[PDB]
């Protein structure tokens, strides 16, 4: 499967969208804690968020946690500091896991994390007039990138 | 060129990350009024909006401004409502100018346009778990297809 993987996500919104791009695709969202909001059911609900039972969700208390519980797989690392493009990996095949993981969208992924993984680091290229794309944005890319490579398995191509 | 073009947007934030996205990659940005929110520069400035001034913005007060002002090139309409996926169609030549125009967050894209422009109508592939993506997202996603078509012209110089 494709998973997202958000490393303590601080703005709602961001989540929000993160989370219907995974509800629209059946990519599966791994959220580490702290988050910077609540995501309560109640809550949710009178906010709109329908989609939101659809999506295939897990919470962790740790990136030590969620390794943990995530042995198998590809893992990927999103990051401006990445000196390989999010293009330059197969995605394509169903059977494997790839993960995508993540930073705050202030503080981005711990530099030890960049650093031990640095040869799985992608960055999304970039013009020098930002620092950095919306979070959001950026996994919507990764997860339509891989289901690309994938044609698109469990996808309505049509209505 | 690449273009997104947004058709009477409602929501702030999607029109500031997408206006992001330009300034990251070069893409220009195609403003179809009424808006809703104010884009006067010192309300941009209160926002935050350090990035916006690099942005190539173009302001229309009706599609038909738009189309006036827009005779030569290729025209996408993004919309669940198409029946060819987002990456179905060739934007590999960096000399052309593409143009991707999307709908308002609420009504989407008129019903008219969206007939008379069939062929050329795109729909990033879903489940049924949701109605749509956000818009800003979907903007996120053609650009970054485009610019992998074209092996990422003008991005990550002098990083
Ligand atoms: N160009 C890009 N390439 C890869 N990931 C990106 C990206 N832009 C944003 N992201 C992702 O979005 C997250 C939040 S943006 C954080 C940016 C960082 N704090 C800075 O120095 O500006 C990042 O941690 C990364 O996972
Ligand atoms: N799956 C998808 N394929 C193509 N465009 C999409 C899309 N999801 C969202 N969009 C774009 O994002 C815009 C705003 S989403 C608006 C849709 C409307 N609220 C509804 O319930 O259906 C759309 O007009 C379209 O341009």
């Given at each position: 499967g494709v998973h997202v993987v958000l490393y303590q996500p601080e703005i709602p919104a961001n989540t929000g969208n993160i989370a219907r791009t995974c509800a629209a695709t059946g990519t599966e969202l791994h959220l580490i804690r702290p988050l910077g909001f609540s995501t309560d059911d109640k809550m949710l609900k009178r906010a709109?968020?329908?989609?939101?039972?659809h999506v295939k969700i897990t919470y962790y208390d740790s990136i030590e946690e969620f390794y943990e519980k995530n042995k198998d797989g590809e893992f990927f690392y999103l990051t401006?500091?990445?000196?390989?493009?999010?293009?330059?990996?197969?995605?394509?095949?169903?059977?494997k896991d790839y993960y995508f993981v993540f930073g705050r969208e202030?503080?981005?992924?711990p530099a030890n994390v960049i650093e031990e993984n640095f040869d799985h680091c992608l960055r999304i290229p970039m013009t020098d007039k930002v620092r950095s794309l919306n979070l959001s944005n950026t996994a919507a890319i990764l997860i339509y990138e891989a289901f690309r490579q994938q044609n698109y398995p469990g996808l309505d191509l049509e209505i």
């Amino acid at each position: 499967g494709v998973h997202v993987v958000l490393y303590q996500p601080e703005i709602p919104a961001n989540t929000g969208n993160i989370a219907r791009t995974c509800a629209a695709t059946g990519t599966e969202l791994h959220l580490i804690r702290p988050l910077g909001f609540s995501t309560d059911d109640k809550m949710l609900k009178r906010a709109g968020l329908d989609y939101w039972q659809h999506v295939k969700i897990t919470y962790y208390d740790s990136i030590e946690e969620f390794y943990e519980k995530n042995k198998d797989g590809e893992f990927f690392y999103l990051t401006k500091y990445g000196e390989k493009a999010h293009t330059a990996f197969d995605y394509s095949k169903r059977e494997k896991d790839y993960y995508f993981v993540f930073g705050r969208e202030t503080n981005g992924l711990p530099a030890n994390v960049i650093e031990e993984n640095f040869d799985h680091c992608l960055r999304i290229p970039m013009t020098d007039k930002v620092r950095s794309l919306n979070l959001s944005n950026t996994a919507a890319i990764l997860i339509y990138e891989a289901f690309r490579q994938q044609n698109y398995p469990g996808l309505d191509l049509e209505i």
